[PDB]
């Protein structure tokens, strides 16, 4: 279906694949960006411990601070996904 | 110039006005969303201590975790600004 293009990552290759998997599941289940974001966030809080934050959209710029090895920014189809741990 | 509409806030009224002021300055200085976001973030890290994160755009949904009293989501013109402290 949708093409995963990883743009910037500070994250193990294993967890990068988990991120792409999660977002694919999220996009399968939800249509609204905040719901997609919430699905991805909660699953990472569950799997990799708090505290994650997720942004999903077609138009945004960001500037965030993340713990090393806990950052990924990627496209899955025409939507961009920012996912990182801070706190 | 641009209209500040606050959508969701968990933040003192004082700091809410600071946020709107900062974003207005950012939009005066920068055109690119990531640069606008960076300006706002760094100024809040400076003024209110780390760690802030800022998202600026016309199309995004988000799900984040913030420290109480340190969250604002608002429109300034046709751009939306998410600004919150976590970490």
């Amino acid at each position: 279906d949708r093409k995963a293009v990883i743009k910037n990552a500070d994250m193990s290759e294993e967890m990068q694949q988990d991120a792409v998997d999660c977002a694919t599941q999220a996009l399968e289940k939800y249509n609204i960006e905040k719901d997609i974001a919430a699905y991805i966030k909660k699953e990472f809080d569950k799997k990799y411990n708090p505290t994650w934050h997720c942004i999903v959209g077609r138009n945004f710029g960001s500037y965030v601070t993340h713990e090393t090895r806990h950052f990924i920014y990627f496209y899955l189809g025409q939507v961009a996904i920012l996912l990182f741990k801070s706190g | 110039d641009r209209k500040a509409v606050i959508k969701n806030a968990d933040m003192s009224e004082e700091m809410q006005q600071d946020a709107v002021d900062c974003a207005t300055q950012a939009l005066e200085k920068y055109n690119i969303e990531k640069d606008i976001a960076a300006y706002i973030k760094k100024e809040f890290d400076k003024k209110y201590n780390p760690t802030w994160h800022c998202i600026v755009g016309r199309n995004f949904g988000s799900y984040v975790t913030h420290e109480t009293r340190h969250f604002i989501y608002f429109y300034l013109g046709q751009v939306a600004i998410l600004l919150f402290k976590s970490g």
């Binding site: 710029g61 500037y63 950052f71 920014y73 961009a80 920012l82 | -």
Partner: peptide, 10 residues
Amino acid sequence: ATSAKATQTD
């Protein structure tokens, strides 16, 4: 332990 990142949609 932490880094700052900028992202921009194209």
